[PDB]
C-alpha cells in the first residue's frame, strides 16, 4: 500500500464526509424534513393523535386567561486599576424587514468625575413605549484617561442584575470599576475491493457523522441507504458488519434550470427576477419507481456546439433547411468538369438548387417541377440567356420518359409569355 | 460533480475554525457546542455573578448564584440554542438567497 492511493482514498472519503459534517450542523439547526415523520423512522415520536379528538379551539383562550390568573440611582465608585465616567442607555430594537443590522440607540445621560487607584438619577426614563419595539436595554459605562455594556432589561421585562453595590470589568477599544445600582456495528470500507480499513462502532446506533439517536437498526440502514447516497451500504449479520463502498455513478448536476450554468461568469444564479425554462413533470409516488415527462436538461447546437437557450427550442428547428456546404460542393463538383460549357453548368447548378430547395421523388410531380422553375428562376435565365440549354435539359429529362411533351410546350410558352 | 475545490477548501477551513472555536468532535461528541464561562462582573445582600461566554456574543451574559464551578464548561445541543442568534457560527448555515 503505497502513499499515493492511500492519500487518494483519504481525499475521496474526506470530501463527502466534510460535506456531511457541514450538513450535520445545518440540518440540526435548520432541518430539511422532520425525522419523526418518516415511515421507516417513527419511534422517535412519543405521542399519538388522541388529544386531537377531544380538542376545541374556541375553549383555548380561557386556558391562557388562567395563565394570566423605576428611580434608577446609578452611583459610581472608585475604580480598581494600576478617572471620569459616563452612563448611557443602549436601546437595541427588533430587526425590521428593510434593515439587516439591528436598530441601536445610545442615549448618554451625563459624565462625572470619579477617583481611581458621583451618581446619576433616572426617574422612569426607559422610553420603551410598550409598542413591541425595545428588544433590550443595556447600561454602558464609558470612561477614558475601558468601555463595556451589560444587559439590564431582560426579554420579559425582567431585572438581570441585583441592587446594592457591584463591580464590573471593562475592555478598551484586574482592570475594572465599581458602582451602586438601586431601583455493535462495524464499518468495513472497500475501495478497489481492498480492505483498506476495519473499525468498530463506538455507540450502538448513534450515526457516525449525522449523529441521530435511532433505537432500531433497520431505520439506520434505510437512513444510510437513502441519505448520504455517495456511499453504498451492505450489511450481513457477522459480528454487525457494514460494507461501505463509493458510488461512482452519482447524478451530480444542477438539479434545476441548467441554462444558468453557461452564463458568462462561472455558474451564475439568476435568482433576482424571473427566467424561462422548459416544462417537466416528475412523479415519484402515487400509492406506495420514478417517471419524468418533458425535458429538464441543457442542450447544445449541432454544428457549433454552443449552449442552446430555452427560449428557442421549437422555433428555428435545426437540421432542416439543408446546409450551404452541400450547395458549394454541388457547385464545385460540376465546375471541376472539363468538357462542359458555361451555360450548361449554369443551368445545371440552377436545377440542383431548385431540386434541393424543393425535394421531388414522385415522377408525376416532375411535371409540376418544371412549372415551378420558370416560376422560381425564369427571371434569372433571361438575365443570363439560358433558355436554349434549359429546353435542352427539358428534352433530356423527356428522353427518360419522366414528362410529356405538351407539358414542355406549356412550360416554354408560359416562360416566354412573361419574358416579353 | 458540482463540488469543486473552490467550495471544498472554504468549507474545510470554516469547519476547522468552527471545530477549534467549539470543540465539537473533541468534547462535544459531534452534537454539542461547548461554551466556557468568564468572570464578567459580580454584585453583592446575596451575591450574584454575571458571566460572558467564550466564543462569541451569541449567548447572553448569564447571571448565577453561589453553581459557579459547575458552569466552568457547559455543553449544549445546537437545536437548544436560540434560533434568532445561532447563525454567527458559520454564516452560510442560512442566508437569504435574493437579498432583496
Amino acid at each position: 500500500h503505497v502513499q499515493a492511493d492511500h492519500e487518494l482514498f483519504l481525499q475521496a472519503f474526506e470530501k463527502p464526509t466534510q460535506i456531511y459534517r457541514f450538513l450535520r450542523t445545518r440540518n440540526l439547526i435548520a432541518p430539511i424534513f422532520l425525522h419523526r415523520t418518516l415511515t421507516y423512522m417513527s419511534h422517535r415520536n412519543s405521542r399519538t393523535n388522541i388529544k386531537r379528538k377531544t380538542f376545541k379551539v374556541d375553549d383555548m383562550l380561557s386556558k391562557v386567561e388562567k395563565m394570566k390568573g423605576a428611580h434608577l440611582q446609578l452611583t459610581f465608585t472608585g475604580f480598581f486599576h494600576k478617572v471620569t465616567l459616563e452612563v448611557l442607555l443602549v436601546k437595541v430594537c427588533h430587526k425590521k424587514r428593510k434593515d439587516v443590522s439591528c436598530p441601536i440607540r445610545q442615549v448618554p445621560t451625563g459624565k462625572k468625575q470619579v477617583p481611581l487607584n458621583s451618581l446619576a438619577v433616572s426617574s422612569n426614563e426607559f422610553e420603551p413605549s410598550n409598542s413591541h419595539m425595545v428588544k433590550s436595554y443595556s447600561l454602558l459605562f464609558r470612561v477614558t484617561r475601558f468601555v463595556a455594556q451589560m444587559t439590564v432589561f431582560d426579554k420579559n421585562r425582567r431585572l438581570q442584575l441585583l441592587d446594592g453595590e457591584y463591580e464590573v470589568a471593562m475592555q478598551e477599544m484586574g482592570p475594572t470599576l465599581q458602582f451602586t445600582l438601586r431601583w455493535r456495528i462495524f464499518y468495513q470500507f472497500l475501495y478497489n475491493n481492498n480492505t483498506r480499513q476495519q473499525t468498530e462502532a463506538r455507540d450502538d446506533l448513534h450515526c457516525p457523522w449525522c449523529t441521530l439517536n435511532c433505537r432500531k437498526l433497520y431505520s439506520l440502514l434505510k437512513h444510510l441507504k437513502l441519505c448520504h447516497s455517495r456511499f453504498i451500504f451492505n450489511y450481513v449479520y457477522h459480528p454487525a458488519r457494514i460494507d461501505v463502498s463509493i458510488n461512482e455513478c452519482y447524478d451530480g448536476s444542477y438539479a434545476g434550470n441548467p441554462q444558468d450554468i453557461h452564463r458568462q461568469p462561472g455558474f451564475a444564479f439568476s435568482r433576482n427576477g424571473p427566467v424561462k425554462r422548459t416544462p417537466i413533470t416528475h412523479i415519484l409516488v402515487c400509492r406506495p419507481r420514478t417517471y419524468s415527462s418533458g425535458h429538464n436538461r441543457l442542450y447544445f447546437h449541432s454544428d457549433t456546439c454552443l449552449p442552446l437557450r430555452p427560449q428557442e427550442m421549437e422555433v428555428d428547428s435545426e437540421d432542416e433547411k439543408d446546409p450551404e456546404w452541400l450547395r458549394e460542393k454541388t457547385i464545385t463538383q460540376i465546375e471541376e468538369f472539363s468538357d462542359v460549357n458555361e451555360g450548361e453548368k449554369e443551368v445545371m447548378k440552377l436545377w440542383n438548387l431548385h431540386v434541393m430547395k424543393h425535394g421531388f421523388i414522385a415522377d408525376n410531380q416532375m411535371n409540376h417541377a418544371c412549372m415551378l422553375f420558370v416560376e422560381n428562376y425564369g427571371q434569372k435565365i433571361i438575365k443570363k440567356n439560358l433558355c436554349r440549354n434549359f429546353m435542352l435539359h427539358l428534352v433530356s429529362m423527356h428522353d427518360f420518359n419522366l414528362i410529356s411533351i405538351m407539358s414542355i410546350d406549356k412550360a416554354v410558352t408560359k416562360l416566354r409569355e412573361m419574358q416579353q | 460533480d458540482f463540488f469543486d475545490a473552490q467550495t471544498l477548501d472554504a468549507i474545510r477551513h470554516r469547519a476547522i475554525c468552527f471545530n477549534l472555536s467549539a470543540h465539537i468532535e473533541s468534547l462535544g461528541k459531534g452534537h454539542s457546542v461547548v461554551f466556557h464561562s468568564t468572570v464578567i462582573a459580580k454584585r453583592k445582600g446575596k451575591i450574584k455573578l454575571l458571566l460572558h461566554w467564550m466564543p462569541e456574543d451569541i449567548l447572553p451574559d448569564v447571571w448565577v448564584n453561589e453553581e459557579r464551578h459547575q458552569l466552568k464548561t457547559k455543553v449544549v445541543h445546537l437545536s437548544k440554542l436560540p434560533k434568532d442568534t445561532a447563525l454567527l457560527l458559520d454564516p452560510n448555515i442560512y442566508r437569504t438567497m435574493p437579498q432583496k
Binding site: E14, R21, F186, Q198, T199, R202, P208 | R12, N19, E25
Partner: peptide
C-alpha cells in the same frame, strides 16, 4: 478493530489541517 469509527472521521475531516484532534 481498535481504530473506532468516530476517531477516523475526525482525523479525516481535518485532513491534516491543524485542528489538533488527538492524533
Amino acid at each position: 478493530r481498535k481504530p473506532k469509527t468516530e476517531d477516523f472521521l475526525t482525523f479525516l475531516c481535518l485532513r491534516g489541517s491543524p485542528a489538533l484532534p488527538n492524533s
